[PDB]
Amino acid sequence: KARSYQIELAQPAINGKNALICAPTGSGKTFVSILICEHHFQNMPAGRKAKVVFLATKVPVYEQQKNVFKHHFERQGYSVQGISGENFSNVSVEKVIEDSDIIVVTPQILVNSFEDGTLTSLSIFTLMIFDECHNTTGNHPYNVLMTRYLEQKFNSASQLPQILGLTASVGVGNAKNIEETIEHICSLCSYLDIQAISTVRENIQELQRFMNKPEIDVRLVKRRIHNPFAAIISNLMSETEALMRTIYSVDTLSQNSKKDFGTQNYEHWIVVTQRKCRLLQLEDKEEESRICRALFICTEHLRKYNDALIISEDARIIDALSYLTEFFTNVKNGPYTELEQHLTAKFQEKEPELIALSKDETNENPKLEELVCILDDAYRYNPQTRTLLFAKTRALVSALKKCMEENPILNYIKPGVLMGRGGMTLPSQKGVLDAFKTSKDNRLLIATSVADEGIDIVQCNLVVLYEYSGNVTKMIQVRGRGRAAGSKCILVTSKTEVVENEKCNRYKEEMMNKAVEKIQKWDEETFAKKIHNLQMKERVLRDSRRKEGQKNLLCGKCKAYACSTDDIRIIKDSHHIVLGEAFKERYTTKPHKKPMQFDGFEKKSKMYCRNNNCQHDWGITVKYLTFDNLPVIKIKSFVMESTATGTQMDFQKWKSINSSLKNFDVEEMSNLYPP
RNA sequence: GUAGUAACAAGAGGAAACUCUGCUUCUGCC
Numbered sequence A: 001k002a003r004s005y006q007i008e009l010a011q012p013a014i015n016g017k018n019a020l021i022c023a024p025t026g027s028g029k030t031f032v033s034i035l036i037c038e039h040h041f042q043n044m045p046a047g048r049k050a051k052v053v054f055l056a057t058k059v060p061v062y063e064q065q066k067n068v069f070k071h072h073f074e075r076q077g078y079s080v081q082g083i084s085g086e087n088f089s090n091v092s093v094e095k096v097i098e099d100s101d102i103i104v105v106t107p108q109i110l111v112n113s114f115e116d117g118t119l120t121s122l123s124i125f126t127l128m129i130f131d132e133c134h135n136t137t138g139n140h141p142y143n144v145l146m147t148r149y150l151e152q153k154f155n156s157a158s159q160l161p162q163i164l165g166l167t168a169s170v171g172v173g174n175a176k177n178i179e180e181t182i183e184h185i186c187s188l189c190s191y192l193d194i195q196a197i198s199t200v201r202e203n204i205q206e207l208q209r210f211m212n213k214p215e216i217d218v219r220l221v222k223r224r225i226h227n228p229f230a231a232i233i234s235n236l237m238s239e240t241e242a243l244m245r246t247i248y249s250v251d252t253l254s255q256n257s258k259k260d261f262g263t264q265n266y267e268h269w270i271v272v273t274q275r276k277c278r279l280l281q282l283e284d285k286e287e288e289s290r291i292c293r294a295l296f297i298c299t300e301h302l303r304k305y306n307d308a309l310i311i312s313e314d315a316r317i318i319d320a321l322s323y324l325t326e327f328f329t330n331v332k333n334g335p336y337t338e339l340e341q342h343l344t345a346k347f348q349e350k351e352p353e354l355i356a357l358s359k360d361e362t363n364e365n366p367k368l369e370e371l372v373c374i375l376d377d378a379y380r381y382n383p384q385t386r387t388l389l390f391a392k393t394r395a396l397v398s399a400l401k402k403c404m405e406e407n408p409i410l411n412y413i414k415p416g417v418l419m420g421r422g423g424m425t426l427p428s429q430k431g432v433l434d435a436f437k438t439s440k441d442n443r444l445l446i447a448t449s450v451a452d453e454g455i456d457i458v459q460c461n462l463v464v465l466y467e468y469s470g471n472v473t474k475m476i477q478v479r480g481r482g483r484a485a486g487s488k489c490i491l492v493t494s495k496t497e498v499v500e501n502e503k504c505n506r507y508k509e510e511m512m513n514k515a516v517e518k519i520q521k522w523d524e525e526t527f528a529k530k531i532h533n534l535q536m537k538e539r540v541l542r543d544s545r546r547k548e549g550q551k552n553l554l555c556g557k558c559k560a561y562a563c564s565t566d567d568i569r570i571i572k573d574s575h576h577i578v579l580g581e582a583f584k585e586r587y588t589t590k591p592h593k594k595p596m597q598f599d600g601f602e603k604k605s606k607m608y609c610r611n612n613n614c615q616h617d618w619g620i621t622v623k624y625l626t627f628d629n630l631p632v633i634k635i636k637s638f639v640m641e642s643t644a645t646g647t648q649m650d651f652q653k654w655k656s657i658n659s660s661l662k663n664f665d666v667e668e669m670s671n672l673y674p675p
Numbered sequence B: 001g002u003a004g005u006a007a008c009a010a011g012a013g014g015a016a017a018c019u020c021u022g023c024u025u026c027u028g029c030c
């Protein structure tokens, strides 16, 4: 049965107005949407029947919500079906929509169906429900769909579906004051054609009985007093930069580094430098290859050292050292050219000293010490605690897992780890979460942002944000993982900037709530005028952007010639194969480590530059239709060279190239083989 | 193959308000 605040939240939409339902995670927004659906079904005009679509951004959420809708509505005689990437290829989308009263989807399913001409109008629906609707920005599938809706609205020749958006946070964007915050919220509202914002106003006491906002503890801790590990690695980085400058004057290509080793700024500098180094053009093409390859190696090595410094700041020296020894093992097992041998030798000269450091107990990381004390204190107090420990990077989560496995909390608590997909598969993710829910001693989950929201996780008594910073929306989401009476959320940092960020979040969240209240005081006319003027601005920008050559592909590492754009064919808008016997000379293959079928293709092999001194990954080979071992190239593996000007360019997406490429044609293909 | 007003920014335009830009970190999706 419905809580009073749920009935309250539904009211603006029960009248047929487009509504944005902003309420805390776990407050039952999906149930509110179900109330709205029930009213919708029962009050259609004569001659009409409803057709509802519920959109979710993540597969596990799609699965969760599909089950909820089936259970609620099938018993009332409604057909409820789901489509996601798991079954998209096994079904006809048009046919599922024809046969279903309610369809639950991931939004790309609908985008693909407009793209392929299966669907021609959103007037096929009477109600569209967007879960996590704050994701409606840019080229997100939600905004691709809403752009289509708004184009229909503008043409004013069709009945639009009602729109319902669900979110726990409208956010603040880059706003610094209430005026800017109102503007940000109205922008989000404009993209979804919202007509009213629905929050709990009358039944706040009831809401507060069900939803307890976690108690925050921001703890500022110290760095190590002395940092000999960082000194040794820093010196190796200085030496590597100097070596790089003897190979080629990198300053004529990208600016000189600030030598701010062990920072994200340095990481970014390396990456920008790598981008510039691969585009180096020389008249002597052999020299271009030699220099580009050498610079590729030097920058990769600098990156790994920088990574190790960052790991050492948050975890143990032995975790940083480990990361490096695993890298150097890979280096030894690869092309392992003379430059690679030299860099490896320079590391191995210092490795004894680094090992000795990694064992000295006076070198312990105080931040990690704080973390262990926090966890000890919590489990000692309440042995039934379940904790979610958030950390930013895969490398740090992996290090923390090792720490907590080797040194169990109170000598018995065991960690599980949740990361994003490669990586971990959705089945793997669910397995870890099942164990964390039920296990007697597995009471600690260490996770990246995969755990912020969406996927079902057991409620946690303790949420620890280990150097885990972000915006207002992220802090609202992570809070919702620790939703119970008695729950705590602790942020642990050695950075005064992170403390200040969290202070700003508190202020901004207050600003957001106030902005919403001010908007809610506007009458319908005022609100609609504001949203309309934003939509017309949007349109004028979109329309202006719409009205607004042959290349060789070169190996992105060694600059060897790969193929011509003339040789490429596009399969199903996405997959770029290369035709002809000539290309076969250019690459070599190894069996694919995860040979699987998707999109009608069977993966066979990985494809590499044939140069043993290079071995750069170029893509895969696949079986498709009547053809085996077709090479599928990935654009990020190559540099493009204009045959007209000789100029080299970097493309991270196929968009700007595809226009110039031919589509796959089964007849053309069939002719390239003996009869 | 692709997305994110996410992470971290850094830089460019502007008198300023503020606009544009990332392939890195992380996650999502087909």
Ligand SMILES: *O[C@H]1[C@@H](O)[C@H](n2cnc3c(=O)[nH]c(N)nc32)O[C@@H]1COP(=O)(O)OP(=O)(O)OP(=O)(O)O
Binding pocket: A574, A575, A576, A599, A603, A606, A617, A618, A619, A620, A632, A633, A634, A635, B001, B030
């Ligand atoms: O350029 C890509 C693309 O054409 C296709 N491909 C690979 N992964 C995906 C995917 O998740 N979704 C879609 N639609 N298409 C995909 O193969 C080409 C080659 O890419 P990779 O070399 O990355 O292929 P894979 O992941 O199999 O190899 P690796 O990443 O293990 O090295």
Ligand SMILES: [Cl-]
Binding pocket: A023, A024, A025, A026, A027, A028, A029, A030
């Ligand atoms: Cl909810």
Ligand SMILES: [K+]
Binding pocket: A610, A611, A612
């Ligand atoms: K070769």
Ligand SMILES: [Mg+2]
Binding pocket: A016, A018, A160, A161, A162, A163
């Ligand atoms: Mg309407």
Ligand SMILES: [Mg+2]
Binding pocket: A470, A471
């Ligand atoms: Mg930030």
Ligand SMILES: [Mg+2]
Binding pocket: none
């Ligand atoms: Mg891949």
Ligand SMILES: [Zn+2]
Binding pocket: A555, A556, A557, A558, A559, A560, A609, A610, A611, A614, A615, A616
């Ligand atoms: Zn190569």
